[PDB]
A paper describes a structure:
The potent T cell response to the intracellular protozoan parasite, Toxoplasma gondii in resistant (H2d) mouse strains is dominated by CD8 T cells specific for a single peptide, HF10, (derived from the parasite protein GRA6) presented by Ld. Here we show that the Ld-HF10-specific T cell response displays a focused TCR repertoire dominated by Vβ2.
As described for other Ld-bound peptides, HF10 does not lie flat but instead bends within the peptide-binding groove to accommodate an obstruction formed by aromatic stacking interactions between elite-control associated residues including 97W in Ld. Thus, the extra length of the HF10 peptide is accommodated by small bends in the peptide and a close fit with MHC, without the pronounced bulge outside of the MHC that is often observed with longer than optimal peptides. The side chain of p6D interacts with the base of the groove, occupying the C pocket. In addition to these buried contacts, residues 4, 5, 7, 8, and 9 project to the sides of the groove, with p5V and p9D making extensive contacts with the Ld α1 helix, and p4S and p8F contacting the Ld α2 helix. Because these peptide side chains project to the sides of the groove, portions of the residues are exposed to solvent, providing potential TCR contacts. Only a single amino acid side chain, that of p7E, is facing away from H2-Ld, and fully available to engage a TCR. The portion of the single-chain peptide-MHC corresponding to linker sequences was either disordered or located outside of the Ld peptide-binding groove, away from the canonical TCR–pMHC interaction surface as observed before.
Residue numbers in the entry:
A (entry chain H): -3 to 99
B (entry chain C): 1 to 194, 198 to 218, 227 to 273
C (entry chain E): 1 to 15
Amino acid sequence: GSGGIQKTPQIQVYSRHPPENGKPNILNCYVTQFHPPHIEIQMLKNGKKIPKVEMSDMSFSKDWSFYILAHTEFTPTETDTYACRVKHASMAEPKTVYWDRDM
Amino acid sequence: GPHSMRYFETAVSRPGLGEPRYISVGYVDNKEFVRFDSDAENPRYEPQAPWMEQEGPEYWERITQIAKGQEQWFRVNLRTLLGCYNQSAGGTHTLQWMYGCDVGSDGRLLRGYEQFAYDGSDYIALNEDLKTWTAADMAAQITRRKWEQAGAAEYYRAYLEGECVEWLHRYLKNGNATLLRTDSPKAHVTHHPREVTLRCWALGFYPADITLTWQDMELVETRPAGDGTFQKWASVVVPLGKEQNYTCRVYHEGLPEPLTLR
Amino acid sequence: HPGSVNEFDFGCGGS
Ligand SMILES: *[C@@H]1O[C@H](CO)[C@@H](O)[C@H](O)[C@H]1NC(C)=O
């Protein structure tokens, strides 16, 4: 809560297509409205680091805060859990955000 | 459809961990097309869009030398700013620069932008006239005076009206298959027992500009979906059995007739 | 195509 010099990331986790078990898709973690820009983003499958995640679309808004997309190809199943885990100076602990399949 | 080119340049200090990290990302509309990162092994500009395979080795060498010079301009101006603000070495600090041009659907220049921020708030910005500056604090008032005397604005105005527009025209033509396409939204509504939440989704659309209305409203900023298309949702909380009175509307460049759904 | 190397520094020391 040094809200004058840091901004806490907003973490959005969503698929390209409405999910269908065993149909190929893309999982996105859009990490937004943060400052300062150093950040670490992992995408997790059943609690473990997905390799070969692409980081793209780094930009900043009119209020100067930072945006970045992490994305990966995946095929959802009934029993695979997906999350985005973020570490940023604004937060004591890494934050893990779980994909909401039914939003 | 009007179009824009924009660059997002950031240096961020990391005291005791090494020199500041310098990143420059270029966009045509909302498509990233080039990127430099000082932390890469072999830092250079790299293409992020397929139309940039048309440019030759001379193009990559010249813009990579610009990034090597620009990196040092950000590192020295970070160190200047510590002395302007009487800040200690050792704290994390950030210098941002956004610049670019907007053109109409006929390609003519609509406006240009040069804006700087220190530690995530306004520093100095060029006005719409491309001639005079807005300084946001006491430090930037001194820069404004020096930059008025040196004629800084004239160098930026020459870029924004010439090079920026001429390269944006070249990229719109070379990337016309990607950049001038229209992918119309695919929309659906989801039903969430809560009150009840109605959520109108737009998926699979290009370009990013859209309007979602319910006929108050939760939403998210339009967001990239990982394959160069965009998505958006807007939600309302409605009375627990009378939700057929509610209608989601979507407007987009690819819908000559807007969608209506419930 | 990016902007060329910035010609001027901030110089915000004052007197
Ligand atoms: C600047 O910072 C130093 C060291 O932190 C401090 O002792 C000094 O009083 C400051 N000078 C001004 C003008 O605030």
